[PDB]
Subunit: 271 residues, 4 copies
């Protein structure tokens, strides 16, 4: 029990020669996860559901930076797509070391107005989808593998109104991490959840003002000032790279004793 | 802002003349919630899905104790049943002051073995069902009403293996409480979640040993000793009345400033 | 099967504090004063502790008697452990036993971390943390088997947006950990230990430092401060009052609070701070 | 748009601690010793603080130099604020500036709440809580703009099953609250403040009190204690080691930890205590 796990020194942070799969990697946070993982030495499998051209673009940019990459189409709202995506994936590079469950959709609405169709729309992707991506990940990962789930500050937030559906779908993920950390440990796989605050993406551009009291008439410039001054003492807006960096840490040997945890990445936000 | 809300003294705990609806009140914890609420002066609407005779029995026992009661059939896994149950309910006693979302099912299994049918079975009732019971509750409750959701120690537990599905369905409820507490406050309604530890019910009798390492061969007598010594410094097993009492507190004026909270009722358990 | 025994009475009698004996530290003013009053109204005999407010303490005692219960005050400063030990010895001499102990006494503090002096750090921790811990030690020793111990915390123990508040916030955060740890030990005498964590509550403490929690609030009128507190800190849209806390303390002190131990109960109207 | 600027370098250089200067309190032994060593291997110049272990401190310094970085030890007891102030003044004189501060120094304690003396309560809080707070005050004043401050917490701050541990547990729990509150203040200099909360880790502290966390463990052999720790406290089935913590400290100290502030990072292998 005194044997050192992995190398001492800077090498413990290396992702050289690893093979990673990221869901929803054609845009936003997922895209940056794939890019950054590629820069650190990973062969990356870029999953997408709709954005086909964007996906082929991420694959090209990763090769340009010195790492191999490939894309695979699959909709997480369909367990069968998830099952085959993983079967294709292991055929591409021969193994799977890291899995980043990133795909997700957003939603806003007073509880009194939520329809069962909208509730199901969100949960099938944000919760049920991540669960099944995790199931297949367990079966296919190398012993000593990694699984990083995507949460949100909304799982614990206390002041965002009309956001129960989305918030609840993300809150469930924090519990999965703890419970899956136990089961998946029989394969020495760690499981954690990243919980970012607002990050500038297409998602952010579409609903940012929903998190801002009386912000319907704010200019894009004003929205970012609010985000910078209101959601962080460090006084700046969050960016995809802010998350990609933490994902890489968890994915490396440096995160070997971190499992069953929820890592908040929001610049000290209070929401 | 200095005006005292409600009466000073012991009367602030009274549930006299209130009308409450409890889902899954024909058995277990729900049954005790209805009984106790009835003893404190509430007219109770006993919902059930399958247990018809048990339901009529709870209604009779409540009348016997001095309060009116009535039963209504509805399956929470069907939004339409929930919609009509509430419409019937307000016709029975003329109004609705307290709603206890209690109905739930249990499930155990290693992540690698979970099927989409089982995952959906559990979430449709424990999560989607509670969400829609809450939606209808909001629409029908009196201003100053109450809504108590049913969680579990499993939402935060860290040592129960093969329990991700159930645990996650309950963990989502803690997030709903915070988010719904905001929306429902426009009607001065409070929303909280009760998170019990093991409580002796039919549920407990069926899966208690799943929470006990190497407990497959334990006698019922031995299971209770383990539960008493292992899950509580107070050295006893949890009982439905332990939960019913806290529900009554939240339902009264005494709980007027308690909203958006998760109240753990497990006798100081560590699971 | 012995495990099937119902603990306490079924029905509304489970909420009763009739004939109980309770001690409240710092009961001459604020939240502590209202705890004693409300506990008094539910039928408890109350020992009103105070460190400085002598005349106010005597007034609380007289008011409780007028409401139909018996009370008496005892002077003690929680900064001196010896004062606490003798306070409990005098307590049991007055009413014969002790059923409920409410550790309420506390002081507030604001200041950028760079400006905190060791004297100010010690000023606060000795009362808010060290004081509560020793009041808890004595409460254990003297409480009836099946008694109650409620510690005073704050929203600041978990708050994320209050600047220049590490000393006070840290002194309260430690209490949440004392509850979980003390709930284990004190259970050998069937005593339950919980922490109440209020949001802002209108007392003397609030009037002195409320604006410190409000960004650019230095020039706000009292009327504007309450509006901010009411609208910003609660979806229910109102300010917190001593009775909001007193009511939850009574629940915890009753048989209704029997299975609730080692917990933190936030009572802030759904605040986000 | 100024908000679109990427903070720091893309790729693996973001994980670099090359040419950084770090100070670690209690770096002559245990977790503190391994933090200094590992930080040294990633390219930092290290100031090795110690209060008593002089010879051990000198050994850590020599080992870091042998691994290719520069180091120096400074004697200081965190119980004396004046020793901390002068320690930081001597620190900047040695390497010219300070980029990373690791508040690691601490003592353990066990005892039923009924048996705790005020002298023992003060012994622990002065080092574990008051000490860390004043090491943090000085770290703020002397740190480079964009620096780092990592406080040492423990699993005990939130643990639910360790009996006779309210003093120590409470002293660590307060740190989690210091992180959230100090992250706000120290951000005016772009410094991030986080808390690492380890589970059991094999050090001298562990060897002295490990059995106290194990029910009926008083007669366990060291071999049996490790097996219990490995199987009971982790699904991964192994014991915690100083390197497991040192690695996470380095992450937080790097540009990779830039958006992580005001957080508690548990590093216990998925333990439940
Ligand atoms: N941005 C923010 O402020 C925050 C975001 N998050 C979470 O981070 C993740 C990414 O967010 P962000 O990048 O902003 O989101 P975007 O809206 O930019 O899209 C993110 C990704 O989700 C993918 N996706 C959507 N539906 C599916 C599906 N059915 N199957 C597979 N993939 C799908 C999209 O791919 P496609 O184009 O093919 O549809 C896209 O690649 C989400 O889970 C989000 O909830 C958490 C906190 C904050
Ligand atoms: N007992 C324990 O250890 C704990 C239980 N809980 C939760 O407390 C609640 C009650 O548990 P417990 O009393 O032990 O459970 P039981 O298994 O005894 O049954 C509880 C109730 O759930 C109802 N129910 C099931 N399905 C539906 C449905 N589709 N629609 C409406 N009602 C339904 C049942 O009614 P019917 O007979 O009509 O099917 C029954 O009334 C649950 O939500 C449970 O998860 C939380 C923590 C611990
Ligand atoms: N007001 C608020 O918004 C909130 C308050 N709290 C906590 O609630 C408690 C009381 O608050 P509040 O009523 O507003 O406070 P006040 O400032 O109005 O008075 C608090 C009490 O503390 C007592 N006290 C002070 N020092 C000592 C001492 N050395 N020994 C014994 N008793 C002492 C005072 O008694 P004396 O007159 O004799 O000095 C007084 O009775 C505190 O612990 C506080 O931190 C928590 C959250 C919010
Ligand atoms: N070991 C474990 O399992 C865990 C430990 N921790 C925490 O990690 C930290 C270190 O633990 P660990 O390495 O095991 O401890 P050890 O007992 O092995 O040594 C701890 C260090 O504290 C230092 N120290 C003690 N008093 C002072 C003082 N008055 N001033 C300055 N430095 C002082 C010691 O230095 P010196 O030789 O000069 O006295 C020593 O370097 C502690 O804060 C501890 O509470 C948290 C979780 C788990
Ligand atoms: O989870 C989130 C998705 C979007 C978002 C979230 C948290 C905070 C802010 C914003 N935003 O879009 O502005
Ligand atoms: O949520 C729960 C449902 C059953 C249960 C739960 C928690 C702890 C124990 C047990 N049990 O059945 O034994
Ligand atoms: O702990 C507290 C003491 C005062 C206070 C606290 C929390 C929130 C508000 C206020 N106030 O005084 O306004
Ligand atoms: O904080 C701690 C100090 C020692 C320890 C702690 C947590 C868990 C285990 C052990 N141990 O010494 O075995």
């Amino acid at each position: 029990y005194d044997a050192i796990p992995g190398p001492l020194g800077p090498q413990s942070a290396s992702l050289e020669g690893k093979v990673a799969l990221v869901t929803g990697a054609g845009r936003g946070i997922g895209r940056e996860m794939a890019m950054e993982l590629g820069r650190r030495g990973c062969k990356v499998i870029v999953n997408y559901a709709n954005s086909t051209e964007s996906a082929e673009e991420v694959v090209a940019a990763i090769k340009k930076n010195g790492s191999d990459a490939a894309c695979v189409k699959a909709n997480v709202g369909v367990v069968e797509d998830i099952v085959r995506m993983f079967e294709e994936a292991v055929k591409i590079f021969g193994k799977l070391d890291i899995v980043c469950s990133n795909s997700g959709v957003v939603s806003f609405g007073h509880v009194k107005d939520v329809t069962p169709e909208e509730f199901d729309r969100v949960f099938t992707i944000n919760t049920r989808g991540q669960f099944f991506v995790a199931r297949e990940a367990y079966k296919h990962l190398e012993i000593g593998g990694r699984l990083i789930l995507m949460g949100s500050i909304t799982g614990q937030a206390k002041a965002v109104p009309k956001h129960a559906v989305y918030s609840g779908s993300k809150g469930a993920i924090e519990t999965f991490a703890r419970c899956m950390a136990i089961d998946m440990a029989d394969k020495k796989i760690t499981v954690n959840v990243v919980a970012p605050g607002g990050i500038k993406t297409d998602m952010y551009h579409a609903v940012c003002r929903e998190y801002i009291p009386n912000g319907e008439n704010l200019s894009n410039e004003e929205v970012d000032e609010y985000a910078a001054v209101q959601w962080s003492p460090l006084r700046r807006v969050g960016l995809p790279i802010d998350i990609a960096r933490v994902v890489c840490f968890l994915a490396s040997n440096d995160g070997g004793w971190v499992t069953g945890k929820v890592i908040g990445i929001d610049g000290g936000a209070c929401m």
